Amino acid sequence: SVRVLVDMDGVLADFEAGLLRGFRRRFPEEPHVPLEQRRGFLAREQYRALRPDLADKVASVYEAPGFFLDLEPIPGALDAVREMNDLPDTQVFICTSPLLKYHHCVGEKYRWVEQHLGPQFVERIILTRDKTVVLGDLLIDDKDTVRGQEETPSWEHILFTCCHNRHLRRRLLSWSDNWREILDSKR
Amino acid sequence: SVRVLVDMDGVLADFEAGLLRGFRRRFPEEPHVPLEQRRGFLAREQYRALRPDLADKVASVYEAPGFFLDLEPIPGALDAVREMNDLPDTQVFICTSPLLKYHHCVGEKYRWVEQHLGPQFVERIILTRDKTVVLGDLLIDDKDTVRGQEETPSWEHILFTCCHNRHLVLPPTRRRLLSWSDNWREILDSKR
Ligand SMILES: O=c1[nH]c(=O)n([C@H]2C[C@H]3O[C@](c4ccccc4)(P(=O)(O)O)OC[C@H]3O2)cc1/C=C/P(=O)(O)O
Ligand SMILES: O=c1[nH]c(=O)n([C@H]2C[C@H]3O[C@](c4ccccc4)(P(=O)(O)O)OC[C@H]3O2)cc1/C=C/P(=O)(O)O
Numbered sequence: 052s053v054r055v056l057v058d059m060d061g062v063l064a065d066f067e068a069g070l071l072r073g074f075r076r077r078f079p080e081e082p083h084v085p086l087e088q089r090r091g092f093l094a095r096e097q098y099r100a101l102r103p104d105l106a107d108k109v110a111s112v113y114e115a116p117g118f119f120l121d122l123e124p125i126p127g128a129l130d131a132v133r134e135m136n137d138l139p140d141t142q143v144f145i146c147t148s149p150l151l152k153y154h155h156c157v158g159e160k161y162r163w164v165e166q167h168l169g170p171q172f173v174e175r176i177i178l179t180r181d182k183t184v185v186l187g188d189l190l191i192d193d194k195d196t197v198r199g200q201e202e203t204p205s206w207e208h209i210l211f212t213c214c215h216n217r218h219l220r221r222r223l224l225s226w227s228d229n230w231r232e233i234l235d236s237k238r
Numbered sequence: 239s240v241r242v243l244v245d246m247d248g249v250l251a252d253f254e255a256g257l258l259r260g261f262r263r264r265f266p267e268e269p270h271v272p273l274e275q276r277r278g279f280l281a282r283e284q285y286r287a288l289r290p291d292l293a294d295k296v297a298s299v300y301e302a303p304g305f306f307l308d309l310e311p312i313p314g315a316l317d318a319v320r321e322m323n324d325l326p327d328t329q330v331f332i333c334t335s336p337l338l339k340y341h342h343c344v345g346e347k348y349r350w351v352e353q354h355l356g357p358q359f360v361e362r363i364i365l366t367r368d369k370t371v372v373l374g375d376l377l378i379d380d381k382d383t384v385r386g387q388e389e390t391p392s393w394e395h396i397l398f399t400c401c402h403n404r405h406l407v408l409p410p411t412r413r414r415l416l417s418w419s420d421n422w423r424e425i426l427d428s429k430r
């Protein structure tokens with residue numbers, strides 16, 4: 052049995068697009084960072100580099116009520132994870148970290164999964180700031196390094212391609228890339 | 239380095255006392271289950287056996303807004319977990335399962351930890367319905383069996399004593415903590 056841990060932001064839920072849409076909506080005069088020019092996991096820091104006071108403006112977007120609830124799915128993500136979890140001898144958990152400002156993040160993520168994937172996937176959510184203490188064969192995540200208290204995690208990190216990591220170990224280019232072969236490589 | 243997974247309900251947060259106080263307050267006419275007569279971790283099913291309409295009444299108490307937020311800490315728990323996490327070569331995570339009815343559970347548990355233990359322990363919350371896929375040396379929990387997808391969890395399960403599990407008598411091969419004043423330091427030591 053292969054256990055796949057699947058991150059939420061940038062893999063199932065389109066955080067980058069939602070952040071940019073929310074930023075342009077609420078700060079329509081301000082410069083922004085086009086998705087194709089995003090570099091580095093931390094959007095706030097790139098905004099800071101664009102101009103210092105844009106850091107807090109972009110944070111105010113992802114800290115706001117509704118932000119996580121309203122993210123659009125990543126193309127192909129929902130179908131893939133449904134297909135994946137229906138494969139025999141395969142178990143999917145949605146493994147996601149909340150913001151340190153957790154107030155509008157934690158309940159909204161449970162509600163996002165419930166609406167987009169249903170109650171069966173709500174049962175498969177793992178919230179943690181340290182993915183290295185979760186046991187599995189693979190972790191699909193859009194962050195360059197995934198670090199924590201296990202120096203050698205049980206899972207192999209598959210980097211899932213997102214606008215901010217496109218320009219940087221196995222990679223999945225999209226959910227249309229061949230994720231079945233990666234799972235097979237663990238059977 | 240020893241990693242200790244610490245459950246919330248019945249170990250840090252007094253769920254049983256909160257449930258009974260909330261039931262007596264809202265359903266004062268109805269029969270209840272005294273804490274010392276609790277048996278089995280599913281309170282709702284014992285109420286159901288007492289009388290069928292009590293099952294939904296008691297659920298309404300722990301499904302209500304505020305319920306998890308307002309629970310009192312277990313005596314000694316907060317001091318113990320702070321001491322435990324300050325020990326060298328020791329890491330504590332708070333490893334808790336939300337209700338399937340998660341709406342007033344999930345945020346409230348985060349806020350409970352933030353208020354009673356601070357932001358440093360908020361960072362150490364793991365929410366999961368399957369504790370068996372979480373890696374650690376020990377899991378301290380008040381539930382008789384802890385089951386899930388790993389047939390052989392990495393951790394050893396230490397049963398923490400609560401009104402509903404007190405009647406169980408463990409085989410010599412398993413370990414119990416009677417309270418936070420019992421010798422949890424030795425259990426951790428056994429893993430060093
Ligand atoms: O500080 C930040 N700056 C920033 O630009 N972001 C963007 C990037 C993305 O990061 C994450 C994120 C999760 C955990 C820790 C940091 C960031 P994800 O891994 O879920 O994509 O969720 C918050 C999102 O916010 C987050 C954070 C989050 C900080 P933290 O969560 O408090 O550590
Ligand atoms: O059916 C139940 N009946 C019941 O009496 N309870 C009580 C007992 C205890 O159950 C727990 C519980 C949480 C997760 C899985 C089972 C039980 P905990 O052991 O964490 O305290 O959640 C809070 C408490 O609520 C929960 C449930 C939980 C149902 P679900 O599986 O979350 O739908």
Ligand SMILES: [Mg+2]
Nearest residue numbers: 058060061193
């Ligand atoms: Mg991510």
Ligand SMILES: [Mg+2]
Nearest residue numbers: 245247248380
């Ligand atoms: Mg418990």
